[PDB]
Design a protein around this ligand. Sequence first.
Ligand SMILES: Nc1ncnc2c1ncn2[C@@H]1O[C@H](COP(=O)(O)OP(=O)(O)OP(=O)(O)O)[C@@H](O)[C@H]1O
Ligand SMILES: [Mg+2]
Ligand SMILES: [Mg+2]
Ligand SMILES: [Mg+2]
Ligand SMILES: [Mg+2]
Ligand SMILES: [Mg+2]
Ligand SMILES: [Mg+2]
Ligand SMILES: [Mg+2]
Lengths: 1066, 112, 116, 30
Amino acid sequence: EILFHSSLLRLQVEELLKEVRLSEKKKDRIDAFLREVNQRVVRVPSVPETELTDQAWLPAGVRVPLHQVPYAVKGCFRFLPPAQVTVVGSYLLGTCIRPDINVDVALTMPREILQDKDGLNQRYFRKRALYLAHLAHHLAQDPLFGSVCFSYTNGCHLKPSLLLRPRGKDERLVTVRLHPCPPPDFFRPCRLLPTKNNVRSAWYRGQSPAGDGSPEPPTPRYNTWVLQDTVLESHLQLLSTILSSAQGLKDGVALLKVWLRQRELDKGQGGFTGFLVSMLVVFLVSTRKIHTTMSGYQVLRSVLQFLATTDLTVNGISLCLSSDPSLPALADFHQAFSVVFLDSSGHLNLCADVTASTYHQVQHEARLSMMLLDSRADDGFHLLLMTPKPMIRAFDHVLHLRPLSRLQAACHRLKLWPELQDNGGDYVSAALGPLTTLLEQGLGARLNLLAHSRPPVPEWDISQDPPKHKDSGTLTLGLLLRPEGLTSVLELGPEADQPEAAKFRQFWGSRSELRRFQDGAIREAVVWEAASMSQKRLIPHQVVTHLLALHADIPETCVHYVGGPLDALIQGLKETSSTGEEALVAAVRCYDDLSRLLWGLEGLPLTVSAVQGAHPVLRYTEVFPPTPVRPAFSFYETLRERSSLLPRLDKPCPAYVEPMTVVCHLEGSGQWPQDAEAVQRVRAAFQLRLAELLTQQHGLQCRATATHTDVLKDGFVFRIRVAYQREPQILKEVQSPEGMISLRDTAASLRLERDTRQLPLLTSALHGLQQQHPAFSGVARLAKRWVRAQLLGEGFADESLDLVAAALFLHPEPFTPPSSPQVGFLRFLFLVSTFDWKNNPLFVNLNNELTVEEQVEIRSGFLAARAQLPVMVIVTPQDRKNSVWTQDGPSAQILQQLVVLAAEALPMLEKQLMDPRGPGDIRTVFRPPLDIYDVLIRLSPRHIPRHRQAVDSPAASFCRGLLSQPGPSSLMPVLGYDPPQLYLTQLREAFGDLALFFYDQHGGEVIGVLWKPTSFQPQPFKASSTKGRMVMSRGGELVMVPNVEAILEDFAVLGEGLVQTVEARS
Amino acid sequence: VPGFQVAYVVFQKPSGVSAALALKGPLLVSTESHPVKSGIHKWISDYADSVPDPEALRVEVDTFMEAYDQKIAEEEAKAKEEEGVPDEEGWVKVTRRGRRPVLPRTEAASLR
Amino acid sequence: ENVFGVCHIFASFNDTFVHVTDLSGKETICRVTGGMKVKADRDESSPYAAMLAAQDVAQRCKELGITALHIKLRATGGNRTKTPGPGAQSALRALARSGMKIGRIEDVTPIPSDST
Amino acid sequence: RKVKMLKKPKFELGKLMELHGETGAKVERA
RNA sequence: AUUAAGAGGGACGGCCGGGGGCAUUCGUAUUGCGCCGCUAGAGGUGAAAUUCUUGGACCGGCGCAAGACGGACCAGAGCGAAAGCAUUUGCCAAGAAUGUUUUCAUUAAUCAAGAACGAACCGACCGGCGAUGCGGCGGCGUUAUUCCCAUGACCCGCCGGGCAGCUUC
Ligand SMILES: Nc1ncnc2c1ncn2[C@@H]1O[C@H](COP(=O)(O)OP(=O)(O)OP(=O)(O)O)[C@@H](O)[C@H]1O
Ligand SMILES: [Mg+2]
Ligand SMILES: [Mg+2]
Ligand SMILES: [Mg+2]
Ligand SMILES: [Mg+2]
Ligand SMILES: [Mg+2]
Ligand SMILES: [Mg+2]
Ligand SMILES: [Mg+2]
């Protein structure tokens, strides 16, 4: 019902609000604290008039929080107690977010301690800093405050702030920021235009006092900062009239700040804060977009429309209702600032610190949020406001600039002297703008969005020097790749005739070169060196390295590209060129040739009707793609009755070859037997006939078996299975004793339908999905590697991991579809850790085929019959009401074990990638603990064919009997032979009821044995339970116990030679 | 793949059975005269016999189908003889071999 | 090998058109009508005029490398007659007389299914 | 008797390269 | 009062039909429009002349829009009281014949008046023989075969009501 859905949305809004708001009792205790702060601040001693340069009157233990780089000034200082104390901010406005509660107090400076010319050469900033220094000294000794600290207000390094927190209990309850402010009408608003000057060049840089030269450059950021203090009380007055009266407007503001918090768009210098949306909602109330009668959800809806549709970098908006002829124009602000907003006083940009890159990225998030808002579906509220979006998980590649001291030289290479003079000495924030624009224009085709990290606001205690710009933090850039345009390895420029070619030569330098093509055009072009798909994915690394060195004098050593470090986990020991996409395509082309060979074969009694592949290789999900092989004659011995080789006793285990299953359906006919075991006979005859014709017409090596035929073509081995359409129906025939024959599902019948019908459909469906998303193969293969490395490969089917990986690309509602393997793997770990498998089935909408009406009906049936379904339920359009891929899937135990491991591995892996230094060991999360297992079995690497696939490379390899030279082979190699898997089958059948075995199929050298606690308890003699159980008489009665000592030597006996040693603990 | 199994063993005389119950020994399975193969040695020997003979496979398939077709032909001939032909006590068996179509004895037909 | 082209021969009772295009029929190689050869409205559909038009088209093709032609014979169609005109037979003969090789012969006369 | 094409997907180069199986040439600047 | 008419009414069973209504849908042809290629003509006649064309007519290719129409399959076949009825699919109501050991029990026939709709030789003259459409019954044999959907295609005999022929009394 729509009423139920609306009520659910109302309930979801309310429970979020009560969590994020503050209680009444906390408000009272905060109110008592601020009254105590008011009493303390008003009782402060005064000092006589002193020169600003004279700072010896400061006692030891307190330092000026400004760095005062040009020390010569022209002012005098006097301290007086504050004339007026006013609480400003959002505390009295009723919009405070729970994790961080802050209260702002404005201190009105007396008129008699400030001079008319204090707005020049940072004199006011110096006086304000010394005012806080005197207050910090006198308030430190007071036992009321648990901690007192210095910090930056409004993200400005020239504006220090004072932090006070209470002692003992409630120490995390609230913090108070103390903001000195000038008298209301002290300064002239006309003196603080973006086009006017307030810092003189002779004082800032020159040694001469009146050196003549060019007119003084305007200082818009300096003017904005000075006016920022003068208008502190005005914002609260406007918001009280408009926002305090109407409830629900507060709800929308609170929800929007949570939305900004989740996407990490509020904190840092120049961030889009919750103060800004307070003015944005006021502007919308001024217009007809918002009226005061909506709820909080509608306010969130209305604001998000404005952000996604309005660009503030070209068309600024004004909050000033009055339109005076002698009023500042918006054109001037656009020339001075990247983003233009306005207040009732036109001089206040109010957004002078937010960059164009920041606003574009906020627009990007707003557009994504509107698509979820417009679409009607369940869990949309959870995805919109509760799903975190860190930079590492929202961008395909991240980039680190390790030494920020080099960024100062970038300002020297470029022309930012007026801008460096305007913002004091902050070279980091000055060059952030031009560098992003420089990189954005050079990466236009290969990128969708570029973002930069914001430096955190420092907090340092009294009696320490303030932090420098060099040690502010580390700079990180986020890149959102465009899937189209990554296929090309060239950047196409203009032709050499028209004169904008010279412009192209300027931007790229020596790498710009002349090229001619088949179309007949002479053209300027630049060519990179990228052979594989992975190398083409790292083309922007070459772009950013070349451009930064050429145009910013930033060496390549200062650039750390975090792109595909995980690619080594799905590669060879030393092969970093490709991740395996080229090998998979070659195998697919071989399969297509074989299908065409079947489609045209003559002499068969029944013609071929359908050829379908049912192997992970054909759907690009094989972790290690195969290669064509040529057996060595001397490494084996030969039967000479059949063209089949056998492994030798003295040589090590041969190379592993896995045949790929192909399902073939013949022409329908009515001459087939109606008996279950007789159809098995006809199928076996078809296996023999198919092998005989294939070797006669095309000279292919074929081996016929009762269930399949193995064909060697182009070095690849294919396993061909012939299936009969009505065979599953025959297996369902059950004549009942009363005398009526019916059709009932059977485990054999269900297995046959999965192998011949359901498996080819999923393989073909996932094959098509890879075509739209080239990054699907890397994510899926890496996901299997991590699961199998944690020794939890048993219980997780190959198809189940493919389907959950496909869910990332088909339903990435918070994000965009992944374009790099590393970002998909992080989202895969997040999905496993956070998904509620108990109350939600995973939907994989393969090629649409399901609408919202069918989804809610399936969801309704899911809760009605949850107990009959497995712990993990995956819903596909082909397979609904059941999950055939997880019926034999994970148990309740190992499912929770993976969630714990995934929740543990995610924080350390993201920390490794976000470290400015290189990752210490990318294989840390791929190693198992090896502590909980009762018995550990070690295997000899001589008889492990899949040993190059190990996580830890051994760097030494045995001879496996393969020929390096390509060519044909006249004989069948060894197929599907590995001692580790043969050993596991023997163990899991003899001791399956007693213990559990854990192994890694990719290079595993250890088998973990865990005893079952229930089986080891004494039991009475049951004849069926005497498998390895022995007779005790300690209690005077005959009971059964496992024979631990005899089982251990069975581990050595079974697998003789393969087993190296047996160690048992506890 | 074998695991833990049970054994039924038959001797010539019951006297040997009584000796088997009275037999007390280590029961070495592998001796120098009669070694028992295990490990990689056994699996290689197992992979040797896993490869089948196409001619032996073809003979069994043809033999089974020849027997199966003969059984089917006998049943059809017997049913053709028995169609119609009321027996004692006046009973006629309804079959699909007649000219009037009949309702099948299936669950799907009954529910329909 | 032989380089192939498509030749369209529209043969009305009033006029005869011979037109040679590529395999896709989108690019025009040469088009000569019956009226361009004879300076009389009586003989626009005459077999003599069509033969002259065919020779001029045929001679055009050889220097371009065209050696074989596919022929699409077409009449007025529609509500009118579906019979090839007098110029059709002479023009097709002249193309073979000029040494041009002949591919498949198809009629592409538009036949209406529902009478108006 | 007849097959018609109604809708085509987005043109992708790699799909065609399976069915059918550049940087350019160098020119010296003056 | 009895029976339950080779009198009539109703119900039930499986079918059958270009019967009617509402929506939905496809197919060529024609015409017009938009773009690409080419270049002096195209159209019409007994001969011409009205018309269209270097601002590109006609011809060749691709796509779009509009108004009609529903071929061949199509029969002396079928349906409706008549006038009349032909692409696909869904829906609504109606109907003939056949099958019936169901039900009522004379409730019927013909009709001036009146009412609904309405293109643009002769005569209830007994029969017969062939085919033909639907429904039913029986059958030696062929032919497919039934998860659902469906139990049919051909041949032979028989019973009814129809569309028509050829003959007879
Ligand atoms: N760009 C700006 N221009 C002018 N004043 C600003 C700007 N940014 C912040 N301020 C001022 O900073 C003061 C401190 O409040 P602030 O904006 O930090 O909100 P807050 O109390 O932390 O609110 P919330 O909890 O809702 O995020 C306010 O009085 C506000 O007017
Ligand atoms: Mg604040
Ligand atoms: Mg009666
Ligand atoms: Mg009826
Ligand atoms: Mg009907
Ligand atoms: Mg009908
Ligand atoms: Mg109808
Ligand atoms: Mg009939």
